[PDB]
Ligand binder design. Sequence first.
Ligand SMILES: CCCCCCCC/C=C\CCCCCCCC(=O)OC[C@H](O)CO
Ligand SMILES: CCCCCCCCCCCCCCCC(=O)O
Ligand SMILES: CCCCCCCCCCCCCCCC(=O)O
Ligand SMILES: CCCCCCCCCCCCCCCC(=O)O
Ligand SMILES: CCCCCCCCCCCCCCCC(=O)O
Ligand SMILES: CCCCC
Ligand SMILES: [Cl-]
Length: 494
Amino acid sequence: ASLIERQRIRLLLALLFGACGTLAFSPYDVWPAAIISLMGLQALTFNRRPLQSAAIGFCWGFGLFGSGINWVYVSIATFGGMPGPVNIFLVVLLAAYLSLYTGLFAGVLSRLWPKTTWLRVAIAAPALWQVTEFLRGWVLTGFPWLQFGYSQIDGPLKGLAPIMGVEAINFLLMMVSGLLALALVKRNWRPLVVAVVLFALPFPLRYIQWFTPQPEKTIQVSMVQGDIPQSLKWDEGQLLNTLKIYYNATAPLMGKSSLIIWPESAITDLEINQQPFLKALDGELRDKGSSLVTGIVDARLNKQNRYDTYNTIITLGKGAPYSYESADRYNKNHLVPFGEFVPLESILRSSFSRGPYIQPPLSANGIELTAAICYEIILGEQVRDNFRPDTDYLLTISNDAWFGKSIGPWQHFQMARMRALELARPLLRSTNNGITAVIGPQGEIQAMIPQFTREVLTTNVTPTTGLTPYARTGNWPLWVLTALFGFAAVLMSL
Ligand SMILES: CCCCCCCC/C=C\CCCCCCCC(=O)OC[C@H](O)CO
Ligand SMILES: CCCCCCCCCCCCCCCC(=O)O
Ligand SMILES: CCCCCCCCCCCCCCCC(=O)O
Ligand SMILES: CCCCCCCCCCCCCCCC(=O)O
Ligand SMILES: CCCCCCCCCCCCCCCC(=O)O
Ligand SMILES: CCCCC
Ligand SMILES: [Cl-]
């Protein structure tokens, strides 16, 4: 009845529609839940004072992030060793912090566009959503987790991503959901019909093959899922076991896999301390026709006699002869706040160093791979900026053990697939215990191995070539459209 007119009621409803969005993502993968959840955000903010709407937008995001990233509890409650009730409160406060952007969005849109209009709902709303999600992903090194475009990796809007990137899918979903909500509140069919047409219009885009496979460059790839337990992962007494596990999994594959991939910091020891093992492995790999790509930590003495410690990938074997001075390596550029550095260096009473934002592809046995470590693979623009036309495969390596048996590693994995569709290359993804797989150049799963197991994924994979429209332009076409919408929307209501 008029129960829905009560602000506190709209806030409770905001939690449910918000938390409903978590179902859009992996493993749930009910992509219609994203439109449900966005319709709630669009409708529940109608006809509210701007500060009430900002609260509703806040409470909507608290349902999303509260239900969707509460897996960070495992990382927190294990990495930083605090009481438990306290690690719960940290997860709340992170879910609260992210919900500020979703409260910012609702407040500004209520303030600038108070009327229940298609202008507010289809023009202002997605342009403002483009900006607020941008800030959520940039401020304090950002956290653009749970963006609804990723739930379309297997959906009808798929074919938009090679054109304009996953954020164009975000933009269209907010638009389509706004007119659906507008139609229901104002019981009018015109925004319903528009919402359908716009939702259907990208459907033929998934028929466009932007890439050309290179069957002559097809190689066999192995990725060793070592399954080194996080409680023992960096124990300074079982490096030998880790070294024996990965080596013994790799030796029988030499001469048969052109490319072998060990996950993030597989070698759990400084690169400078492992020269005899690395020099020895390199010659063996080269003696066979094989090449190895592995993560490792490099504490590198700088010019100033201090140490820069990097999260790195190194290359050995055929076509990439190992050398501590080699240029065939990649240093992680985007570091995990708290996990890899203390955010805000203004304090005083350690922290990884960063590699450059743009780095050349690694080269192993004649194959060029564009690398990302851990959740770097979710930074669509950073990946596209490192991508080169001569790239053969996308490569990401990750240790998802920090998130345990939750929906975390599935969300991470879904986002990495979006990169394969966007730049239309295969994605090689290599992890410690979770979600090691090969993604085809259209985001399909070509191969995966089960989580929490010690084994190697071995399969043939064909490099592709050609440039998608998004690989040629990055994010700037969508920004121009959001500036046009923003300029246009603001011009009327101002
Ligand atoms: C500004 C307000 C924010 C609100 C408060 C938020 C607090 C929780 C945030 C992050 C938890 C840390 C996650 C740590 C996950 C571990 C990742 C990691 O450490 O991986 C690299 C490894 O350590 C090297 O090999
Ligand atoms: C009328 C509102 C419709 C929405 C119905 C409620 C859906 C709630 C979301 C359920 C699952 C969300 C994920 C929580 C599980 C987790 O934290 O791992
Ligand atoms: C069982 C609850 C499910 C439905 C929840 C959605 C309620 C949305 C309320 C829309 C607000 C509209 C109030 C007046 C707006 C207008 O006509 O301008
Ligand atoms: C990326 C999305 C497509 C963008 C195309 C540019 C112009 C489309 C704007 C949407 C029109 C919405 C009008 C609704 C009509 C109504 O309310 O009856
Ligand atoms: C009413 C019946 C029509 C049935 C559908 C016929 C036309 C659909 C076109 C399908 C093309 C799929 C393209 C896949 C992408 C690729 O080629 O890599
Ligand atoms: C904007 C400075 C980075 C601290 C998280
Ligand atoms: Cl690790």
